Amino acid sequence: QVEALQGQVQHLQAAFSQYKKVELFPNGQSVGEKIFKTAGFVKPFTEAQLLCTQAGGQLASPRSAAENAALQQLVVAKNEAAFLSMTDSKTEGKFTYPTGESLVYSNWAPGEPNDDGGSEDCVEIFTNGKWNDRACGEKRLVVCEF
Amino acid sequence: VEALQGQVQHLQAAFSQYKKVELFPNGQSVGEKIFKTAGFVKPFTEAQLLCTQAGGQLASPRSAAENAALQQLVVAKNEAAFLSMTDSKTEGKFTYPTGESLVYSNWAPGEPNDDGGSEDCVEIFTNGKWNDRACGEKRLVVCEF
Amino acid sequence: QVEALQGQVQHLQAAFSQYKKVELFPNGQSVGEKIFKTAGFVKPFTEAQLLCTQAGGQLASPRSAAENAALQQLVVAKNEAAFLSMTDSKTEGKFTYPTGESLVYSNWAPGEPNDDGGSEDCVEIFTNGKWNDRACGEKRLVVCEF
Ligand SMILES: OC[C@H]1O[C@H](O)[C@@H](O)[C@@H](O)[C@@H]1O
Ligand SMILES: OC[C@H]1O[C@H](O)[C@@H](O)[C@@H](O)[C@@H]1O
Numbered sequence A, C: 001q002v003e004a005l006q007g008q009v010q011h012l013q014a015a016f017s018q019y020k021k022v023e024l025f026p027n028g029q030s031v032g033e034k035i036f037k038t039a040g041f042v043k044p045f046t047e048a049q050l051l052c053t054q055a056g057g058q059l060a061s062p063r064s065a066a067e068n069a070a071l072q073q074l075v076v077a078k079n080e081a082a083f084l085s086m087t088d089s090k091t092e093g094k095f096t097y098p099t100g101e102s103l104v105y106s107n108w109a110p111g112e113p114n115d116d117g118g119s120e121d122c123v124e125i126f127t128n129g130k131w132n133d134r135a136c137g138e139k140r141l142v143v144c145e146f
Numbered sequence B: 001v002e003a004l005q006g007q008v009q010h011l012q013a014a015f016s017q018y019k020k021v022e023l024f025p026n027g028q029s030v031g032e033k034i035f036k037t038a039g040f041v042k043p044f045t046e047a048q049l050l051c052t053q054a055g056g057q058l059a060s061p062r063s064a065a066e067n068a069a070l071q072q073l074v075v076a077k078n079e080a081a082f083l084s085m086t087d088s089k090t091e092g093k094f095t096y097p098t099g100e101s102l103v104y105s106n107w108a109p110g111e112p113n114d115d116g117g118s119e120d121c122v123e124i125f126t127n128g129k130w131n132d133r134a135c136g137e138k139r140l141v142v143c144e145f
C-alpha cells in the first residue's frame, strides 16, 4: 500500500517540479527557498507594500549577494528600478526590514544613502543591482518575495 | 512509511508557497473557488470561449464573499468585468451557464434595466455593483476555477 | 497514520489539479507531457533562446501534429508568429534541434525552407500553423517548452 501511495507522491513531485518552472517564467526568480516575483507595473511605496502583504508576502528583501543578483534579473528584464522593503522612517539613517530588524546586507551605490532633499526614506534597486535611497512617494517596479 | 510522510510535508509547504506566487497579482482565492483575470478586454462571446477552453467559466459570484473577492481584481485593473450570467433565453430572467436562476445578486440601483432594449449580459463595476450591459461591449475577462 | 496520510495526498491531488488549469490560463497550453508557455513579447532568436534555457526549458520544439497544433493555439491567441528552437546554422539546409538531432516532424509552408536571400537559418510558425525559415535577427513571439 505504501509502495503505491509513494508512487502517487513521487508522480506528484514530478508534475509539481515542472509546474514550478512554468510558473516562474517569465516574471519570477527562485533563489534558495525564497521566490521573487514582479507584478509588472509601478507604484508608490505604500501601495506597493500593501499589494505584497495582501498577497501573503512582502516587498523584495535581498539578504545576500545571491538574492540581490536574483532580484536584479527581474529588474533588468522589466528595465525598471524596483522598491525594496527596507526604510529608515523610524530613525533617520538606520534602515530596517519591516520587522524592525537592522540590515544584514546592503549594496549601496557609491555616495548612498544620502537622504537627498532631507527626505529619502525608501530604497530602490537599479538595473545594475546597486541601491539608492529614494523618496517613498516615487513610483517604482513592484516586486514581492514569498 | 515515515520517509513518505516527510515527502508529503515538504510537498504541502512547497505547494502552499507556490499557490501564493501564482495568485499574485492576477488571481483571488475565496473558499474553494479561484478567480483569475486574463488582463485584457473582450466581447462576451469570446470572453466566454476563453474560459471554457481553459477548463473553467466566466466569474460567477454566488455570495457577498465571492463578489468582494472578484471586486478586488476589477479594482486592481480599474476595468469592469463580465459575469457569466445572461437573460438572453428569457428576457428579464438571468441565469447561470448551467441554467439555474441566480441564487445571489448585487444589482446597482435601478438595474437590470435592459437599456435600449438590448442588454442581456452583466458587468461588475469597481464598486462591486452589477449592471446589465450589451454583450457586444468589451469588458475585463475574468474566469473562475 | 495511513488513513490520515491518504487524506493529505488526496487533498494535494485535488488542489494541484485545480492549480494546473489556473496556471495555464491564459498563456499556456498543455499537450501530452509537454507544456508550451508564451512570455507575451517578441525578441530575436538568440535572446529568445537564452530566456527559455535560463528558465530551465527551451524554445518550442513541436515533435508531432498534436504538439504543433497546441503551439498554434498560443500563436493565434497572441496574433504573433513565434520562433521554434530549430536551425540549420551548422550545416545549411539541414535543420536540427538544440541537441543536434535531426527533425522527426515538420510542417513547412509550400516552398519552404527557401533560405531566402541566402540568410535564413531560424524557423517561425505562423498563425495558420505552417513553418517558414527566417533570418534569426528578426523579432518573434517568445514561446518556451517545459
Ligand atoms: O532624485 C533623487 C536622486 O537624485 C540623484 O540621482 C542623486 O542625488 C540620488 O542620490 C538621489 O536619490
Ligand atoms: O449605456 C448603457 C448604460 O447606461 C447607463 O449607464 C445606465 O442606464 C445603465 O443601466 C445602462 O446599461
Ligand SMILES: OC[C@H]1O[C@H](O)[C@@H](O)[C@@H](O)[C@@H]1O
Pocket (backbone or CB within 6 Å): C112, C114, C116, C120, C132, C133, C134
Ligand atoms: O523575406 C522573408 C520571406 O519572404 C517571403 O515571404 C518568402 O520568400 C519567405 O520564404 C521569406 O522568409
Ligand SMILES: [Ca+2]
Pocket (backbone or CB within 6 Å): A022, A023, B021, B022, C022, C023
Ligand atoms: Ca502562474
Ligand SMILES: [Ca+2]
Pocket (backbone or CB within 6 Å): A088, A089, A092, A118, A119, A120, A121
Ligand atoms: Ca527621514
Ligand SMILES: [Ca+2]
Pocket (backbone or CB within 6 Å): A088, A092, A093, A115, A119, A120, A121, A122, A133
Ligand atoms: Ca532617510
Ligand SMILES: [Ca+2]
Pocket (backbone or CB within 6 Å): A112, A113, A114, A115, A116, A120, A132, A133, A134
Ligand atoms: Ca539617494
Ligand SMILES: [Ca+2]
Pocket (backbone or CB within 6 Å): B087, B088, B091, B117, B118, B119, B120
Ligand atoms: Ca433580450
Ligand SMILES: [Ca+2]
Pocket (backbone or CB within 6 Å): B087, B091, B092, B114, B118, B119, B120, B121, B132
Ligand atoms: Ca435583457
Ligand SMILES: [Ca+2]
Pocket (backbone or CB within 6 Å): B111, B112, B113, B114, B115, B119, B131, B132, B133
Ligand atoms: Ca443596464
Ligand SMILES: [Ca+2]
Pocket (backbone or CB within 6 Å): C088, C089, C092, C093, C118, C119, C120, C121
Ligand atoms: Ca546558412
Ligand SMILES: [Ca+2]
Pocket (backbone or CB within 6 Å): C088, C092, C093, C115, C119, C120, C121, C122, C133
Ligand atoms: Ca538556411
Ligand SMILES: [Ca+2]
Pocket (backbone or CB within 6 Å): C112, C113, C114, C115, C116, C120, C132, C133, C134
Ligand atoms: Ca523562408
